[PDB]
Amino acid sequence: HPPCCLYGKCRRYPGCSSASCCQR
């Protein structure tokens, strides 16, 4: 995947349900 927190914020690339901007 690219950066999952792009612009700080939580975009839906494959397996970024465990990015940290996604936790909120």
Short mmCIF file of all heavy atoms in Angstrom, two decimals:
data_model
loop_
_atom_site.label_atom_id
_atom_site.label_comp_id
_atom_site.label_asym_id
_atom_site.label_seq_id
_atom_site.Cartn_x
_atom_site.Cartn_y
_atom_site.Cartn_z
N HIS A 1 0.81 -1.24 0.00
CA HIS A 1 0.00 0.00 0.00
C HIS A 1 0.84 1.30 0.00
O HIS A 1 1.96 1.33 0.53
CB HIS A 1 -1.14 -0.03 1.06
CG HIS A 1 -0.84 -0.17 2.55
ND1 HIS A 1 -0.46 0.87 3.38
CD2 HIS A 1 -1.22 -1.29 3.33
CE1 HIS A 1 -0.66 0.29 4.60
NE2 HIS A 1 -1.08 -1.01 4.68
N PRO A 2 0.29 2.42 -0.55
CA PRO A 2 0.77 3.82 -0.31
C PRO A 2 0.90 4.23 1.20
O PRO A 2 0.70 3.37 2.07
CB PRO A 2 -0.35 4.61 -1.04
CG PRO A 2 -1.00 3.67 -2.03
CD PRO A 2 -1.05 2.47 -1.16
N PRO A 3 1.11 5.51 1.61
CA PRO A 3 0.83 5.96 2.99
C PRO A 3 -0.66 5.80 3.36
O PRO A 3 -1.51 6.35 2.64
CB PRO A 3 1.23 7.43 3.01
CG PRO A 3 2.13 7.62 1.78
CD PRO A 3 1.61 6.60 0.74
N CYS A 4 -0.98 5.04 4.42
CA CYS A 4 -2.39 4.93 4.81
C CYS A 4 -2.96 6.17 5.54
O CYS A 4 -4.15 6.44 5.35
CB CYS A 4 -2.72 3.70 5.64
SG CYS A 4 -4.50 3.64 5.50
N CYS A 5 -2.16 6.91 6.35
CA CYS A 5 -2.60 8.21 6.83
C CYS A 5 -1.94 9.23 5.89
O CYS A 5 -0.76 9.60 6.02
CB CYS A 5 -2.17 8.41 8.29
SG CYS A 5 -2.52 6.97 9.32
N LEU A 6 -2.73 9.61 4.90
CA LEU A 6 -2.38 10.63 3.94
C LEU A 6 -3.28 11.79 4.34
O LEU A 6 -4.50 11.69 4.53
CB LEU A 6 -2.79 10.18 2.54
CG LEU A 6 -2.20 10.99 1.40
CD1 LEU A 6 -0.66 11.03 1.31
CD2 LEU A 6 -2.80 10.58 0.06
N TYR A 7 -2.60 12.92 4.42
CA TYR A 7 -3.14 14.18 4.96
C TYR A 7 -3.51 14.15 6.50
O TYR A 7 -4.36 14.89 7.00
CB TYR A 7 -4.35 14.61 4.09
CG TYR A 7 -4.41 14.46 2.54
CD1 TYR A 7 -5.50 13.75 2.00
CD2 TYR A 7 -3.36 14.82 1.71
CE1 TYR A 7 -5.52 13.41 0.65
CE2 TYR A 7 -3.38 14.48 0.35
CZ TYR A 7 -4.46 13.78 -0.17
OH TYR A 7 -4.46 13.40 -1.49
N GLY A 8 -2.85 13.22 7.21
CA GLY A 8 -3.28 12.65 8.49
C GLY A 8 -4.33 11.52 8.57
O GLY A 8 -4.46 10.94 9.64
N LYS A 9 -5.12 11.29 7.51
CA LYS A 9 -6.47 10.72 7.64
C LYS A 9 -6.61 9.40 6.86
O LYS A 9 -5.88 9.03 5.93
CB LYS A 9 -7.49 11.78 7.10
CG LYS A 9 -7.62 13.09 7.90
CD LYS A 9 -8.27 14.27 7.15
CE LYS A 9 -9.77 14.04 6.79
NZ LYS A 9 -10.33 15.22 6.11
N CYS A 10 -7.62 8.72 7.37
CA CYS A 10 -7.75 7.26 7.29
C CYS A 10 -8.48 6.80 6.02
O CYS A 10 -9.71 6.77 5.94
CB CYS A 10 -8.40 6.85 8.60
SG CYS A 10 -9.09 5.17 8.56
N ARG A 11 -7.65 6.45 5.03
CA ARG A 11 -8.08 5.95 3.73
C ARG A 11 -7.99 4.41 3.68
O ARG A 11 -7.15 3.74 4.30
CB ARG A 11 -7.29 6.62 2.58
CG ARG A 11 -5.81 7.04 2.77
CD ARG A 11 -5.16 7.69 1.57
NE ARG A 11 -5.88 8.92 1.24
CZ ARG A 11 -6.30 9.28 0.01
NH1 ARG A 11 -5.80 8.79 -1.12
NH2 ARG A 11 -7.25 10.19 -0.07
N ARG A 12 -8.91 3.88 2.87
CA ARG A 12 -9.29 2.48 2.82
C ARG A 12 -8.52 1.63 1.76
O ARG A 12 -9.09 1.01 0.86
CB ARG A 12 -10.85 2.50 2.66
CG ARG A 12 -11.52 3.03 1.36
CD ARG A 12 -11.57 4.57 1.22
NE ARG A 12 -12.36 4.97 0.04
CZ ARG A 12 -12.54 6.25 -0.36
NH1 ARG A 12 -12.03 7.31 0.26
NH2 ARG A 12 -13.26 6.46 -1.45
N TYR A 13 -7.20 1.59 1.95
CA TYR A 13 -6.28 0.68 1.23
C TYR A 13 -6.20 -0.72 1.91
O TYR A 13 -6.62 -0.85 3.07
CB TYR A 13 -4.88 1.33 1.16
CG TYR A 13 -4.69 2.64 0.38
CD1 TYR A 13 -3.98 3.68 0.99
CD2 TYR A 13 -5.15 2.80 -0.94
CE1 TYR A 13 -3.73 4.86 0.29
CE2 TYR A 13 -4.92 3.99 -1.62
CZ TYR A 13 -4.20 5.02 -1.01
OH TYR A 13 -3.94 6.17 -1.69
N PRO A 14 -5.69 -1.81 1.26
CA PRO A 14 -6.00 -3.19 1.69
C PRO A 14 -5.16 -3.62 2.93
O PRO A 14 -3.96 -3.89 2.84
CB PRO A 14 -5.75 -4.07 0.45
CG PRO A 14 -4.91 -3.22 -0.48
CD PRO A 14 -5.25 -1.79 -0.15
N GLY A 15 -5.85 -3.64 4.07
CA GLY A 15 -5.23 -3.94 5.38
C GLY A 15 -4.85 -2.74 6.30
O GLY A 15 -4.05 -2.91 7.22
N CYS A 16 -5.44 -1.55 6.07
CA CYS A 16 -5.32 -0.35 6.92
C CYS A 16 -6.52 -0.09 7.90
O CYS A 16 -6.53 0.93 8.60
CB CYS A 16 -5.20 0.79 5.90
SG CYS A 16 -5.18 2.34 6.76
N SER A 17 -7.45 -1.04 8.07
CA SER A 17 -8.14 -1.25 9.38
C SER A 17 -7.24 -1.36 10.67
O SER A 17 -7.74 -1.14 11.77
CB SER A 17 -9.08 -2.48 9.26
OG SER A 17 -8.35 -3.69 9.05
N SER A 18 -5.93 -1.67 10.50
CA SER A 18 -4.88 -1.47 11.52
C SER A 18 -3.79 -0.41 11.19
O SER A 18 -2.69 -0.46 11.74
CB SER A 18 -4.30 -2.87 11.80
OG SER A 18 -3.45 -3.33 10.75
N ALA A 19 -4.14 0.65 10.42
CA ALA A 19 -3.57 1.99 10.64
C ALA A 19 -4.14 2.62 11.94
O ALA A 19 -5.19 2.26 12.48
CB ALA A 19 -3.78 2.91 9.43
N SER A 20 -3.34 3.56 12.43
CA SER A 20 -3.60 4.26 13.69
C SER A 20 -4.47 5.55 13.64
O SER A 20 -5.29 5.77 14.53
CB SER A 20 -2.23 4.52 14.26
OG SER A 20 -1.40 5.39 13.49
N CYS A 21 -4.34 6.38 12.58
CA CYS A 21 -5.43 7.33 12.17
C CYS A 21 -6.88 6.76 11.93
O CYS A 21 -7.88 7.47 12.06
CB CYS A 21 -4.94 8.06 10.90
SG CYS A 21 -4.50 6.90 9.58
N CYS A 22 -6.95 5.45 11.63
CA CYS A 22 -8.15 4.60 11.58
C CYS A 22 -8.82 4.20 12.92
O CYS A 22 -10.04 4.01 12.99
CB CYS A 22 -7.70 3.37 10.75
SG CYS A 22 -7.74 3.75 8.98
N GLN A 23 -8.02 4.13 13.98
CA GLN A 23 -8.44 3.96 15.37
C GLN A 23 -9.26 5.15 15.97
O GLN A 23 -10.32 4.87 16.53
CB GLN A 23 -7.16 3.57 16.13
CG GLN A 23 -6.43 2.23 15.76
CD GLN A 23 -7.32 1.00 15.45
OE1 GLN A 23 -8.28 0.71 16.17
NE2 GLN A 23 -7.09 0.30 14.34
N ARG A 24 -8.83 6.43 15.80
CA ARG A 24 -9.68 7.63 16.04
C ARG A 24 -10.14 7.95 17.51
O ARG A 24 -10.41 9.12 17.81
CB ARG A 24 -10.83 7.64 14.94
CG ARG A 24 -11.77 8.87 14.93
CD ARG A 24 -12.96 8.85 13.93
NE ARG A 24 -13.88 7.69 14.09
CZ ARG A 24 -14.89 7.63 14.98
NH1 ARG A 24 -15.21 8.61 15.83
NH2 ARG A 24 -15.62 6.53 15.00
#
